[PDB]
């Protein structure tokens, strides 16, 4: 049977240390989930699982989907869990939810994600048995995880930015090419804001009191010349570095939720199914070239769906970094026109990259922009730390 | 198409701060995975995904399945990921493996779990912005996580054990019977050791001294009801009628479980020996203060979908999180004495240990291998889940 | 048996907690005050026989910090130095120590001083060397933690210093209005002293990267009784009648203090101009939860030693650890509204701040300088001390 | 003015770092030693007027530690106390301070001592107060970190005090054997003193949980040049010609020392037996990288003040932080093999350990008591000081 996506929503995306620095991952997740049940008006015991992507879990919220479920007031009968495939986690939680709906096990599930990167822990694996001999280390959960993701034989000291410079260097991507993508990314998001199509995805959030409904990172005044004045983060290590804060996705706080269900049950509950899952694909690449993950994964998803990238009307590619994104679009042999059907309400550079919540944000816009365009096929894909890719093909209902 | 389970193996299980204490969660999973491929002889490019249950992740190993894959020397073409549903995470990882294999998306994946409770980090949410005004609290991941799993509206200061006491209380469960179970638990494990059946199950783990360890660290031959009665209930100081001790509780432990999830065709094509196939599974939400009873609704869901009853099930694995917890489920299953002879035949949580993430894969290793050994048909694996859940799968022999 | 006289007592400005000197260390600040003291006086660095520094939150960044400040300020390697701790009374303790060492003949000229960077005081743990497996791990704020442990296992004070302030508030029936009035008056005197130009006489301007700072950051031109009334007591939750706030407490701050201690003969030999001499000093112990009354017996000891009474005393620096604390002390002294006219005349801990190690030398700089402008005779410096102590000293104008 | 005599100088046994007193804090040790001293002297607790303790790794578990040891030992709340640090000379410094303020007529009886738990020195961070997102967060071992900071930023020494020992080995052309011979001799005197029952008057035995300990952990009767010859010089990777090993180095250790400082009259009135009086003392600064030669200029200062020469000293205590270091001092002292028999007759830093803050009162224990046992006249106590200082006292038999 088919699994359709209904009402994919998200909180606004906050900056790192910004408007949402007060709220936990659970706080953001609860808000998106209650917001979701509010719009759909569906009984809480219609929900058979809350599966969330969450890339920096800690014991503040074990098996977070169940915690977000209980903290949103859902009955104790609603199960929940946590998944982590880095950047892809949110799509992973949607694909899993589709698998257990299409298989007949479940009729309705919540698939989503929650990340508060402002509150990702520092931690130590040296404090339990003694730091006498070894010394004690305390790691920044964000930084550390970005050098360790490829395992001990595959380290990347400079993390995700080092990988983005790897691609820049491999693919001869100019610094101007990267700042150009960055500015245009901001335009789309600012345009989408003013057009009012973002109120359709966004579950506003109350903070200690004010209620925020706009995203924190997109800037109206962003320009190419302005971006030119920024320092490439790894410029010391690399005279030919290009990747800066301006052409990189930021760190951010958000949550994302959607209903995954069947057409019959959606009809029964008065829901409006936007898209259905067609195919998906997962790929592994070299950790130091992670950014090219979207190419082998997209291949597999398209192949499964018997389509070509030519058959795809709309694309969500996350853009962890301009350089990375440009490397994927180069493989895809893209023209200027293709740019007009890719990330048309923004991307990670302009909207931010609240990692576990990013998969569900691309889904919100992809699903929604498809119905308003009355287009047919949609592709969602993302590079993944440690060297993976993930792509799903969605079809409008 | 079916999803079948091949060569499910595990490490030995070390105690907390014990023999595998210098070994990380990745170390243990790499050993287990490397052992799986060595026995099965499959080319490493045949693996399409490594899905691991892993309950105290940190940035020493993000999306851990991927890291285990790489550190085992698997092609960088092999994806992997990490799942958390507390105790039920090793089976969760299996079920997910079955779903994406039965769906036709994949022909072969690895499902397992990995836990080093010995090396679970200490963490703080106060260092990023500074403790100038608030101070800096550092939490024990193990200790903190027993409080939080039910959220802010369903508080449990004493965690899973406090809920194990609640079951003793609501179910009228005596310490004697609790300790009688633990005793039974050790000599089924200790039996199963001398009978040499753990041999098929276990990937011997080499440690620098260099020795190879191949026997589980917690089982004890000299366990008796009398010796256990001497044990102080952990929550005695708050509770007069308290019964739950270290002796009828599962410990904190270090291990990894690995398993091949594929189709009957692919396994024939690779010379594999499928043991069980997935018949059904179920998940259930219960009260966070009474988590222990989670297997009961979950099992009925799994049984319902299968078209079976608990009579149809010949072999049972229940993780014995606590004796009281386990007895309460068996009391709900209206269990008798002969029912015990089909339940937990190589030991369980109290004797073998409970390395949370790897537990669903130990139970699977036993269920599948013992079903085959006895030429029994149906097996049931089920487990209570911190926070108040239950998961259960029904497996059928091939 | 010679006299001990004090020459050119100076200090840095006093920065706010997390304020204008946050990127500077206890040593940086001490190096500035010392270089300024040598630069004004012109004393040859190899005339300095010891650099004795009161310093309340030492760590291994700067061991025996008087030595480190001496070295980092460019003094020869022949100049010895050390660190002393008696909490708030450390800066005075270091002067009293210098006086003893000079009156005896062992030395002729030393530097006595203090240095605190509360902005940069460490967080620490005594659980991580051998592990928190069995105990758990704490990370302690050296500020907050030191304030509850100061009185030992038999006299713990969970609410720290603020708690002791409240205790003095209750015992002496001290109103919020009163404490807020003292504080307002404290800022007034500081802000005026500043406007009148007298504070620049004490101050060594500090280079901070790039500018030069020469003005105390903590005082406020705009303090009112009405503004103060708005503030919520730190301990209001614990105690409905709590009165101690941010506004009527001393601040946590960054500064350093230094002065020459030498003999009359020696000052004369180098053509230095002594400001005051040590008449007497006393120290005393009180209940740790009543430390704040420490100055009362310490003063009585110092007076009796000196054959004086508080009526012989033209000027008083009594550190305002807390308005509730300063008011209690004066109550034991039975103070007039007129008596405030001779007490803390350019401000104190509440308005200028309380860089704990350095505060003793701040009070001395004021006291000694202001004894000359009024052409008074006797001055008293005294301080309550966490853990329940007091220190007092009588200085006489030369 | 009046004289100052040292009564009943005692210590705890000295424990190895991570050794027998690992479980005890510096306060635990300071209390043990202070109670010992109080019970042995029968003095009334309210007769102590100040507890001045050398303490070289203070943290907020025990602020102004003299007062915490005072209160936790059961002294009245009326007894003041403090902490001093001049690194390795810290415990002598406390004696000298106590002396100054008895001779001044200020106090009639104070306690001077030192206390170190190097087993439990804290881990600390300057990176947790204002946040670590842009810098990261580091946490330092207080011991390891102190190895490089004592000399400030203009006189770096990467390998700390050990490197310093190598520098004195290099410049004085001191052989590995000569070094190791001293170590052996250090150990024989230690063990010999145990057998002769002479230590039983220095030592206050220390109860530890699950028994009473009375004997130092580090001496070993079996020490030989041969055994020592096998050890690898700590810094051989950098220096092909290194000599300094764990065997001819002084160690990291745990102990407290206490003694009484009073007048001759007060002693008599209280039944005390005055052992010695402090003739004079001297301090000095030397180049940080030539740290261990500190005792050479400080001894000459102290001897000069006393009107004595090094010939006039019957007993020398020299803390031997390293063999190479001690020997360089002895060389400058023009020692002959006969001079070795009046120097450190019960062991030294190498055989008993170097519990930094308590070393001073250990040397003082042995020096006072061996001057009475030998019917001699003048003792010299001197030690080098990390950071590049020297400190010495000359005492006289009463
Ligand atoms: C983007 C990132 C590099 C930023 O790091 P950062 O140093 O915190 O950067 P900031 O946002 O503080 O920006 C630095 C400055 O650039 C400024 N800036 C941004 N756009 C600008 C423009 N057009 N002109 C001028 N300045 C600009 C910011 O305002 C900021 O200004 P300030 O320093 O004056 O306040 C980092 O957040 C990041 O990308 N990491 C997460 C993503 C990642 O590593 N990988 C995950 C994907 S796999
Ligand atoms: C009292 C104490 C807890 C203050 O906490 P803090 O929040 O870090 O200090 P702050 O400077 O931020 O003051 C807090 C608030 O009170 C306000 N405030 C302080 N003094 C004020 C005054 N005279 N008038 C009006 N408002 C004032 C501040 O503006 C601030 O408000 P804000 O948050 O809106 O900016 C801390 O300074 C303390 O412990 N002091 C005692 C130090 C001590 O024990 N010394 C040893 C003596 S034994």
Describe this protein's structure.
Chain B: Residues 272-397 form the Thiolase C-terminal domain. Chain B: GO terms for molecular function: acetyl-CoA C-acetyltransferase activity. Chain B: Belongs to the thiolase-like superfamily. Thiolase family. The structure is a homotetramer. Chain A is an alpha+beta fold and 397 residues long. The two termini of chain A are 14 Å apart. Chain A folds into 2 domains: 1-124 and 197-277, Peroxisomal Thiolase, Chain A, domain 1, CATH 3.40.47.10; 139-196 and 278-397, Thiolase/Chalcone synthase (Peroxisomal Thiolase, Chain A, domain 1, 3-Layer(aba) Sandwich). Chain A contains 13 helices and 14 strands. In chain A, strands 1, 2, 3, 4, 5, 10, 11, 12, 13 and 14 form a 10-stranded mixed β-sheet that branches. The interface between C and D is large, with 78 and 82 residues. One coenzyme A (COA) binds at residues 87, 159-161, 222, 226-227, 229-230, 233, 245-246, 248-251, 320, 353, 385 of chain A.
Which descriptors apply to this entry?
homotetramer, 397 residues, alpha+beta, Peroxisomal Thiolase, Chain A, domain 1, ten-stranded mixed sheet, two-stranded antiparallel ribbon, 13 helices, 20% strand, globular, binds coenzyme A, transferase, thiolase, T1, CoA-complex
Q: Could you give me the name of the CATH homologous superfamily of the largest domain in chain A? A: Thiolase/Chalcone synthase
Shape by Cα distribution of chain A: globular
Which two chains form the greatest contact, residue counts included?
C-D, 78 and 82 residues
Q: In whole angstroms, how far apart are the ends of chain A?
A: 14 Å
* CATH-level-2 architecture of the largest domain in chain A: 3-Layer(aba) Sandwich
Might you state the CATH topology name of the largest domain in chain A?
Peroxisomal Thiolase, Chain A, domain 1
Provide the succession of SSEs of chain A.
EEHEHEHEEEHHHEEHEHEHEHHHHEE
Percent of residues of chain A in helical segments?
25-40%
Q: Write down how many β-strands of chain A occur, each being a DSSP E stretch of 2 or more residues.
A: 14
Organism (chain A): Mycolicibacterium smegmatis (strain ATCC 700084 / mc(2)155)
Active site (chain A): 87, 353, 383
Family (chain A): Belongs to the thiolase-like superfamily. Thiolase family.
EC number (chain A): 2.3.1.9
